[PDB]
Write an enzyme that holds these catalytic residues in place. Sequence first.
Site, mmCIF file in Angstrom:
data_model
loop_
_atom_site.group_PDB
_atom_site.id
_atom_site.type_symbol
_atom_site.label_atom_id
_atom_site.label_comp_id
_atom_site.label_asym_id
_atom_site.label_seq_id
_atom_site.Cartn_x
_atom_site.Cartn_y
_atom_site.Cartn_z
ATOM 1 N N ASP B 68 33.490 -22.590 -20.987
ATOM 2 C CA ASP B 68 32.520 -22.948 -19.942
ATOM 3 C C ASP B 68 32.865 -24.347 -19.449
ATOM 4 O O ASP B 68 33.155 -25.208 -20.264
ATOM 5 C CB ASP B 68 31.128 -23.086 -20.544
ATOM 6 C CG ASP B 68 30.353 -21.779 -20.626
ATOM 7 O OD1 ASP B 68 30.877 -20.684 -20.304
ATOM 8 O OD2 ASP B 68 29.175 -21.886 -21.037
ATOM 9 N N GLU B 112 32.326 -20.202 -12.791
ATOM 10 C CA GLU B 112 32.639 -21.439 -13.496
ATOM 11 C C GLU B 112 33.077 -21.215 -14.944
ATOM 12 O O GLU B 112 32.892 -22.074 -15.802
ATOM 13 C CB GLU B 112 31.488 -22.438 -13.423
ATOM 14 C CG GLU B 112 30.139 -21.922 -13.881
ATOM 15 C CD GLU B 112 29.412 -21.082 -12.826
ATOM 16 O OE1 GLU B 112 29.420 -21.428 -11.609
ATOM 17 O OE2 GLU B 112 28.804 -20.071 -13.230
#
Lengths: 198, 196
Positions: B68, B112
Amino acid sequence: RMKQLEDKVEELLSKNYHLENEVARLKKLVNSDGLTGLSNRRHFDEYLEMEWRRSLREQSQLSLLMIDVDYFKSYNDTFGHVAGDEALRQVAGAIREGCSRSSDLAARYGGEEFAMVLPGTSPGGARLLAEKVRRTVESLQISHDQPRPGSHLTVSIGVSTLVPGGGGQTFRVLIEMADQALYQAKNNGRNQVGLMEQ
Amino acid sequence: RMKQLEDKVEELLSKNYHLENEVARLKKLVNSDGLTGLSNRRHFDEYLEMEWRRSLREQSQLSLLMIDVDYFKSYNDTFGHVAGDEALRQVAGAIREGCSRSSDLAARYGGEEFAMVLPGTSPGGARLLAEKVRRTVESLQISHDQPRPGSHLTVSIGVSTLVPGGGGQTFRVLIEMADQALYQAKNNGRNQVGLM
Ligand SMILES: Nc1nc2c(ncn2[C@@H]2O[C@@H]3COP(=O)(O)O[C@H]4[C@@H](O)[C@H](n5cnc6c(=O)[nH]c(N)nc65)O[C@@H]4COP(=O)(O)O[C@H]3[C@H]2O)c(=O)[nH]1
Ligand SMILES: Nc1nc2c(ncn2[C@@H]2O[C@@H]3COP(=O)(O)O[C@H]4[C@@H](O)[C@H](n5cnc6c(=O)[nH]c(N)nc65)O[C@@H]4COP(=O)(O)O[C@H]3[C@H]2O)c(=O)[nH]1
Ligand SMILES: Nc1nc2c(ncn2[C@@H]2O[C@@H]3COP(=O)(O)O[C@H]4[C@@H](O)[C@H](n5cnc6c(=O)[nH]c(N)nc65)O[C@@H]4COP(=O)(O)O[C@H]3[C@H]2O)c(=O)[nH]1
Ligand SMILES: Nc1nc2c(ncn2[C@@H]2O[C@@H]3COP(=O)(O)O[C@H]4[C@@H](O)[C@H](n5cnc6c(=O)[nH]c(N)nc65)O[C@@H]4COP(=O)(O)O[C@H]3[C@H]2O)c(=O)[nH]1
Ligand SMILES: [Mg+2]
């Protein structure tokens, strides 16, 4: 409205040219062969080089089938290109169905040439699959008058396997061996499996 | 005549139509992500599915990193999407430095998120590579005001590894476990590697 028309022709010519260029670029970025849906040659080379390194790492057996359609030029001649194309799709389908493991790869290597990459596969296992594929191509019973007028389509198949790491050997020599074996098959009367020279 | 221009135009309309179709067809088959140049999610899914079956066969250890980018929604909002996209470009660059084996694969997993598949790799090896990605991202020193002014862009990474068992066990469990490790990394302060 003849300016209107001539102008539209110009507009469309420009738009089409852009699209043709776009198509050309995308084709170089896609892994599959339009006709058959198998991997194209570029992707075959890339995939095989990668498998060469995996097999090097694991000291595993890397097998390869090089498959050629027999008497194919005359098929196109006596049955037409469209029929030829369909014959190619059918052979491809047989090749595809011939390898079932997640790591197996079926490819269209060239005009009428195919290949199967078989990671972790013994010469014995490769031989079996080769026969299986040839046999499946025959059972398709596609009509050809060559050489005998009552014949059906067939392939010749060359087989090679290597454990990478040996001096002077590369994935390219693996191909050369299978091509050698393919020659044998063809020159022993075609429709058969030729094996590499140990 | 006006009839030759009308036919030529119709011809060009037809050519145009087919070209547009072919372009759209080919775009769906591209395996790379435009922005970052990594595998896209569809290719990642296909690749991981195949690797799972290879690992099942060989009973080998299959590792996964789920990555992440910390505070990324805020980054994109604060600095704008163009800047955000550039950040994703640089993070991808940091990632693909992170693996070298012919079988390793890095991907843009989502808007993302990134992921890296590591066939034949031990938990220890995977953690090593994860730490390397994490360190490389931070060394980019991309300015961020999150969590506080004068911070820099970081990643949190979850690592998992399994030898596939048979039955109804699928590659999705590997992702679930990496996501759980990733949660641990985030809940422990972010900019770190979580494991299991
Ligand atoms: N790359 C590749 N190679 C193939 C494929 N099909 C068969 N082979 C090759 O053919 C050899 C003998 O296959 P078999 O007669 O089915 O005999 C097989 C089969 O009875 C069984 N077996 C192997 N794996 C599987 C599997 O995944 N599913 C099933 N149902 N049986 C399997 O174990 C026996 C020995 O297997 P192997 O020692 O590995 O040796 C196999 C393998 O080297 C294929 O789709 N891809
Ligand atoms: N007869 C025969 N069939 C073959 C052979 N190799 C592959 N197949 C066929 O191809 C399917 C997928 O093989 P896989 O991707 O390697 O994925 C396989 C592999 O990961 C593992 N597997 C199954 N049986 C064996 C085995 O005997 N030995 C090993 N090492 N793995 C196996 O389970 C997965 C699913 O197996 P399946 O449901 O059987 O499904 C197998 C089976 O239908 C073979 O050598 N002989
Ligand atoms: N089993 C085993 N195989 C080995 C070893 N050393 C090299 N190989 C084999 O040799 C190929 C090329 O190795 P390389 O020139 O070091 O080139 C390697 C190396 O530069 C790097 N690399 C991959 N894994 C490691 C690693 O674990 N440690 C280090 N330092 N480098 C690695 O990535 C490159 C490509 O890796 P591969 O595609 O896998 O391809 C590797 C692998 O097939 C080894 O110690 N054990
Ligand atoms: N998937 C993946 N894993 C990586 C990579 N680089 C390092 N690793 C992981 O990190 C562990 C330790 O790497 P190492 O200190 O370089 O220690 C390595 C290195 O000294 C040697 N080695 C392994 N493969 C290669 C290679 O391809 N090239 C070179 N030069 N050395 C290698 O064997 C030692 C132990 O290797 P492993 O038991 O495999 O354990 C490796 C492997 O789990 C990579 O690029 N991709
Ligand atoms: Mg997520």
